[PDB]
Design a protein around this ligand. Structure first.
Ligand SMILES: CO[C@@H]1[C@@H](O[C@@H]2O[C@H](C)[C@@H](O[C@H]3C[C@@](C)(O)[C@@H](O)[C@H](C)O3)[C@H](N(C)C)[C@H]2O)[C@@H](CC=O)C[C@@H](C)[C@@H](O[C@H]2CC[C@H](N(C)C)[C@@H](C)O2)/C=C/C=C/C[C@@H](C)OC(=O)C[C@H]1O
Ligand SMILES: Nc1nc2c(ncn2[C@@H]2O[C@H](COP(=O)(O)OP(=O)(O)O)[C@@H](O)[C@H]2O)c(=O)[nH]1
Ligand SMILES: [Mg+2]
Ligand SMILES: [Mg+2]
Length: 299
């Protein structure tokens, strides 16, 4: 249960947004924020991002820093440009296009806007464009802000540490743990460069036009300079090896950092997705996600 119309009106009013109530539309796809789309009495349309829990707004500090960087240096895609930003409300103008898919909590999966039964080649190609562009923003510009910046070995040690931490808290199935460790311990599989990543790339953030060309990305709380591989994970989860291959190919061809074992490395990172599920469980405190994490970790 989240905020209702009258509550949203009051939050918006406190922030000098005076909404036309009949235009208010709720979008509940986000685990961290309630989203509202609404037009104000000035005829101006808004996205209103309303935090669901105490842990949410503290994670937006880096987000704003990352958006400043991406809005300044990105040329071929849009990102939110926040107009209002307080501990109670973030607001910005809606990006062009529509999300390639959006989570429906009644089924626990996506309602797709693209033909999931035959994904357009332009979607992989253009996501490749967007990611290579993003990942090329100079790391020194991120270091001058409070963003996390990993060298390539720091990215590896960060993964080692995060795994150790989840094992200590939850346990980890022995076979899963051995798989993780064999990946960590295989020098040849790791990237030798890092870049600025989005960190939570998925269909629900990937804005597309009528041709399934990606034109924008929302939700930048996980941006940092680290292993670029994270931004390929959803393509593997949703579209399998073939979809991962298509995205890698496009990224490589347009100038993105590539190394010989990139695909295999990404697949291992996917096998380590339970680390991320566990971390969400701990950060959010949501009991169902603790259960999910234990299942995912094969405890
Ligand atoms: C986008 O990823 C998605 C993930 O959503 C992400 O889940 C990560 C673990 C979170 O990231 C983590 C790691 C971190 C390092 O980023 C950390 O800083 C951050 C705090 O948390 C991250 N957000 C918080 C950054 C969040 O968007 C889940 C949540 C946990 O997995 C979204 C829930 C609505 C889940 O729907 C649910 C309903 C409830 C249900 N179950 C519990 C009863 C469950 C199984 O599925 C829907 C699942 C759909 C599955 C279909 C496949 C194709 O879809 C994908 O693979 C994408 C998803 O996995
Ligand atoms: N179409 C569209 N949807 C948006 C936009 N901004 C946010 N949303 C929706 O609002 C939801 C929640 O916003 P998000 O920043 O992802 O929140 P979080 O996932 O809870 O951290 C997203 O999943 C989208 O469905 C936008 O600019 N356009
Ligand atoms: Mg989101
Ligand atoms: Mg988020």
């Amino acid at each position: 249960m989240s905020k209702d119309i009258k509550q949203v009106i009051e939050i918006a009013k406190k922030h000098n947004l005076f909404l036309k109530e009949e235009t208010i539309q709720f979008n509940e796809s986000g685990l961290d924020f309630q989203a509202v789309f609404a037009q104000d009495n000035n005829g101006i349309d808004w996205v209103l991002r309303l935090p669901r829990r105490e842990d949410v707004m503290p994670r937006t500090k880096v987000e704003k820093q990352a958006l400043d960087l991406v809005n300044k240096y990105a040329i071929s895609f849009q990102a939110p440009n926040w107009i209002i930003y307080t501990e109670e409300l973030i607001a910005y103008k809606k990006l062009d296009g529509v999300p390639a898919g959006t989570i429906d909590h009644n089924i626990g999966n996506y309602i797709w806007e693209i033909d999931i039964n035959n994904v357009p080649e332009l979607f992989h190609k253009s996501l490749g464009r967007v990611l290579a562009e993003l990942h090329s923003i100079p790391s020194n510009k991120a270091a001058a802000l409070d963003l996390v910046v990993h060298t390539p070995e720091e990215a590896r040690m960060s993964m080692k540490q995060r795994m150790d931490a989840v094992r200590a808290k939850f346990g980890v199935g022995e076979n899963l743990w051995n798989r993780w460790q064999a990946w960590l311990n295989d020098d040849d599989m790791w990237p030798k460069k890092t870049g600025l990543i989005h960190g939570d790339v998925h269909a629900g953030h990937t804005m597309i036009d009528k041709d399934a060309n990606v034109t924008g990305l929302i939700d930048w709380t996980e941006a940092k300079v680290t292993d670029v591989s994270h931004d390929f994970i959803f393509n593997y989860r949703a579209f399998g090896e073939e979809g991962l291959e298509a995205l890698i190919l496009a990224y490589k061809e347009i100038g993105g950092y590539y190394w010989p074992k990139m695909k295999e490395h990404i697949i291992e990172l996917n096998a380590a997705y339970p680390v991320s599920i566990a971390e969400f469980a701990l950060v959010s405190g949501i009991e169902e996600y603790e259960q999910m994490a234990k299942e995912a970790l094969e405890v």
